[PDB]
Amino acid sequence: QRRLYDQAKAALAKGNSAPYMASRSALRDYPLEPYLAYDELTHRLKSASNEEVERFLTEHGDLPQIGWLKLRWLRLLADRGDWKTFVNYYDPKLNFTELDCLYGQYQLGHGQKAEGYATSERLWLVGKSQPAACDTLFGLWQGEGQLTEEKVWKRLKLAAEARNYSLASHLAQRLPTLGNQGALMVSVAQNPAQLSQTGRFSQRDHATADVVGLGLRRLARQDPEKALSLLDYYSSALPFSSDEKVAIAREIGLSLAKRFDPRALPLMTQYDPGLRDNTVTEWRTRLLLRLGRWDEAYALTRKLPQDLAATSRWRYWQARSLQLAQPNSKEPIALYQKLAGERDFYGFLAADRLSVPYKLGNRPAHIDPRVLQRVRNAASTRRAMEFFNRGEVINARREWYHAARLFDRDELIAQARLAYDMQWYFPAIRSISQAQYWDDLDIRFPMAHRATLVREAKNRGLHSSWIFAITRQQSAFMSDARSGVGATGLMQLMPGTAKETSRKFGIPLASTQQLIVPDVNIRLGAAYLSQVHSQFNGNRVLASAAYNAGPGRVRQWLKDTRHLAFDVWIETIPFDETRQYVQNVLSYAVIYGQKLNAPQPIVDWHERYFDDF
Numbered sequence: 331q332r333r334l335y336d337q338a339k340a341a342l343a344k345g346n347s348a349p350y351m352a353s354r355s356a357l358r359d360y361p362l363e364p365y366l367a368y369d370e371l372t373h374r375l376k377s378a379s380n381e382e383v384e385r386f387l388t389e390h391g392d393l394p395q396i397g398w399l400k401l402r403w404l405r406l407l408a409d410r411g412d413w414k415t416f417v418n419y420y421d422p423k424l425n426f427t428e429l430d431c432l433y434g435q436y437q438l439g440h441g442q443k444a445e446g447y448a449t450s451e452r453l454w455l456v457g458k459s460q461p462a463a464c465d466t467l468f469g470l471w472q473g474e475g476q477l478t479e480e481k482v483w484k485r486l487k488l489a490a491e492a493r494n495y496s497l498a499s500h501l502a503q504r505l506p507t508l509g510n511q512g513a514l515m516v517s518v519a520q521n522p523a524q525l526s527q528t529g530r531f532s533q534r535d536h537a538t539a540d541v542v543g544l545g546l547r548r549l550a551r552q553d554p555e556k557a558l559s560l561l562d563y564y565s566s567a568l569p570f571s572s573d574e575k576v577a578i579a580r581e582i583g584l585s586l587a588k589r590f591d592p593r594a595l596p597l598m599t600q601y602d603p604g605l606r607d608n609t610v611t612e613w614r615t616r617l618l619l620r621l622g623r624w625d626e627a628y629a630l631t632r633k634l635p636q637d638l639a640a641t642s643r644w645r646y647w648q649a650r651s652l653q654l655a656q657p658n659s660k661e662p663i664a665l666y667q668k669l670a671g672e673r674d675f676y677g678f679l680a681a682d683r684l685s686v687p688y689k690l691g692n693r694p695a696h697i698d699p700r701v702l703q704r705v706r707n708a709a710s711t712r713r714a715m716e717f718f719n720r721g722e723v724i725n726a727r728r729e730w731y732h733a734a735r736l737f738d739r740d741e742l743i744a745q746a747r748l749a750y751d752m753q754w755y756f757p758a759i760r761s762i763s764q765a766q767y768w769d770d771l772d773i774r775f776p777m778a779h780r781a782t783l784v785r786e787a788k789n790r791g792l793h794s795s796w797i798f799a800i801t802r803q804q805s806a807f808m809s810d811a812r813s814g815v816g817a818t819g820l821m822q823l824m825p826g827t828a829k830e831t832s833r834k835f836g837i838p839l840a841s842t843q844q845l846i847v848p849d850v851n852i853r854l855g856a857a858y859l860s861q862v863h864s865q866f867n868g869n870r871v872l873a874s875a876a877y878n879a880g881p882g883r884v885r886q887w888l889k890d891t892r893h894l895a896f897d898v899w900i901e902t903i904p905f906d907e908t909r910q911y912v913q914n915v916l917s918y919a920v921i922y923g924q925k926l927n928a929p930q931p932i933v934d935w936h937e938r939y940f941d942d943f
């Protein structure tokens with residue numbers, strides 16, 4: 331039959347359970363009946379029996395919200411001292427530090443002392459504040475004299491590293507002998523420029539070295555030049571460990587490398603000769619490439635660890651660095667040929683270097699129909715389907731992502747097709763991606779809002795493929811996207827920029843919260859794109875970077891250049907987020923250019939070289 335579960339649901343929310351108890355007998359078959367049961371139990375959880383709660387965890391353990399019930403119930407079980415039942419259901423995988431701390435309590439009061447100390451210490455050595463349950467644990471741990479000054483000092487270091495200075499200071503006022511360098515550590519953490527006064531930070535002991543090390547690492551981000559200078563002093567004056575020294579060299583090296591200062595190269599080379607730090611090894615190479623030092627670059631690309639050497643990046647850059655070093659050599663044509671078959675950015679570059687067509691190769695995976703039925707008939711799916719038909723977007727979305735948490739590779743692809751068939755593009759894109767079936771370009775690069783984008787792109791004369799690329803990279807066709815810093819929508823617009831974009835020329839924006847309309851999003855995004863497209867002479871490489879990082883940042887990254895190749899520039903973008911963002915948009919625009927039958931190379935003729943000269 332047809333069921334109105336809203337009445338039962340309405341009652342339970344802030345109230346009674348009579349309509350649920352009354353109607354429930356009718357809704358055995360209904361998919362969302364377990365949500366009512368969940369709330370009904372949850373309200374009276376304190377007085378519920380173990381047998382009932384345990385029964386509920388068996389019969390509806392698949393529910394997305396089940397972890398919250400386990401947290402609420404285990405609080406009580408531990409509060410009651412029912413530890414036998416606690417440990418039967420305690421799960422580290424839930425990632426509740428309150429439970430982990432309660433589990434530590436159990437270990438200490440039940441003979442597992444070694445494991446209680448390991449648990450306590452692991453939860454202690456953490457630069458943020460922990461739940462009040464942990465104060466209880468840390469109390470017991472301290473009570474057995476395990477909270478040594480070293481371990482409070484070590485957490486102090488982490489808290490200052492985390493910029494949580496209230497915590498850090500509270501820990502500093504708990505140091506019996508080291509209270510002076512604790513206060514000093516928080517001072518330096520707040521302003522590491524104070525290390526200019528070498529006289530004041532010259533007390534040759536381990537703690538002073540700990541603070542100067544923290545300071546040099548922090549100072550490296552803002553004034554690497556000053557830090558490099560002070561390292562030379564402080565390494566004589568203070569008893570730095572070798573591991574402490576490489577961590578300083580890392581941050582100074584990386585910070586100088588990102589400013590294209592060649593003084594990083596002797597430092598990086600001295601302190602990581604083994605190439606043990608990927609990020610240092612990559613930026614050493616990136617830096618050589620920026621300086622036109624093709625010989626050293628190539629040499630370095632031949633020494634890489636196996637996990638860097640496997641990537642399409644350093645395969646491309648081994649070939650290209652050799653081709654720049656020895657232009658008349660043919661060894662690169664082979665290297666590019668291995669790589670030009672891949673469908674990624676560097677694979678497109680390789681093909682572009684040979685002047686051969688790209689390999690897109692849309693080959694939708696063929697699914698076992700039995701697997702398609704198993705996923706379709708799973709209760710988590712039925713529930714997600716129902717929430718969709720009802721119009722509850724977040725609930726349908728949550729059920730989808732929770733089910734995907736433990737599906738195998740076949741089951742994830744099966745899931746992804748079903749979502750695609752319902753014109754629900756983002757969860758299809760998401761599910762197929764975590765299956766790692768990359769070759770279904772129909773699912774991964776859908777034509778959502780094609781009528782809009784094609785027209786908008788003609789307005790503010792742009793390539794249809796490039797607008798499609800930007801959106802797909804920015805949201806993956808989820809209008810509901812809110813960023814970790816507040817950029818929202820199909821074209822992840824900065825709320826502070828969105829207003830300014832609406833004010834600058836602009837047409838009516840009707841609030842930040844009500845920006846979610848795709849059609850609101852699209853013509854604004856086209857306008858902003860054209861603005862930056864214009865700002866950088868129609869260069870999509872630069873313009874794409876400006877979109878995600880700001881034109882002022884891109885200008886700083888173009889500073890003092892002269893005939894810089896496009897591929898080197900992209901590679902030598904300081905920000906990881908933005909390097910990938912550009913490489914994605916450029917690749918996605920190749921793929922959309924195909925699917926829109928308006929072929930688009932990886933870069934246009936006029937994008938290949940640029941400078942601020």
Ligand SMILES: CC(=O)N[C@H]1[C@H](O[C@H]2C[C@@H](C(=O)NCCS(=O)(=O)O)N[C@@H]2CO)O[C@H](CO)[C@@H](OS(=O)(=O)O)[C@@H]1O
Pocket residue numbers: 804813814815816817821822823824827828858876877878879880881882
């Ligand atoms: C459309 C637009 O104007 N974009 C603006 C961009 O906004 C980004 C941020 C990212 C984002 O939110 N990232 C989150 C990362 S995380 O921390 O959550 O993981 N998503 C947006 C586009 O990609 O921020 C810049 C910072 O000044 C602006 O430069 S400016 O010169 O105008 O100021 C750009 O103008």
